Amino acid sequence: MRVLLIHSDYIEYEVKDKALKNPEPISEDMKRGRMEEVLVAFISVEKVDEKNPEEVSLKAIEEISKVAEQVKAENVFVYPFAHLSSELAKPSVAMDILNRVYQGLKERGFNVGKAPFGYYKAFKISCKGHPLAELSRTIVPEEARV
């Protein structure tokens, strides 16, 4: 898994075309979204991750929760972004993992938004440009699931 964390003034998106044969079904309310004061997590689920979806999910939750706490962000936004890596996991695995991360972060008490998986989106972001405003992590499973 590759994660790119952008501490932002806002994040907005507009659902445009479908980018997969199997996109996440979406409601009308999900076509557009916007969130202010927000740790935006751009995430590519990698092929390596398919080995243990739960381990990398847990690890992504912990890691992102920590950057949010040291930048004082109460809002986090999970943003599917296949473009952060070259050895990409299969959509279905990626969709699963992005949800566990998302739900994982909600369970921690944060205010979490998400953009729909499987679509091209217009997006706006405004990076704060602090030392801690731009961070990346590579998170891989250390051992296969049971």
Ligand X SMILES: NCC(=O)N[C@H]1[C@@H](O)[C@H](n2cnc3c(N)ncnc32)O[C@@H]1CO
Residue ranges binding ligand X (CB under 6 A): 19-20, 44-45, 80-83, 88-89, 91, 94, 117-121, 134
* Binding status of residue 48 toward its own copies by CB under 8 A: no
Residue 96 structure tokens: 């699963």
Which contiguous run of DSSP H or E holds residue 67? helix 53-70
The span from the first CA to the last CA of the chain, in angstroms, equals 20
Residues facing 78 on adjacent strands: 41, 114
Cβ atoms of residues 24 and 102 within 8 Å = no
Ranges within 75-114 binding its own copies (CB under 8 A): 81, 83-86
Among the residue ranges 49-57, 67-75, 93-101, 135-143, the one whose residues contact its own copies (CB under 8 A): 135-143
Cβ atoms of residues 116 and 33 within 8 Å = no
Among the residue ranges 69-77, 91-99, 104-112, 133-141, the one whose residues contact its own copies (CB under 8 A): 133-141
Task: Please select the residue that binds its own copies; options are 89, 130, 141, 146, rule is CB under 8 A.
Answer: 130
How far is residue 124's CA from residue 78's CA, in Å, rounded to a whole number? Answer: 14
Task: Please select the residue that binds its own copies; options are 1, 67, 68, 135, rule is CB under 8 A.
Answer: 135
CB of 73 to ligand X, least distance (A): 18
Ranges within 110-129 binding its own copies (CB under 8 A): 120-129
Cβ atoms of residues 90 and 118 within 8 Å = no
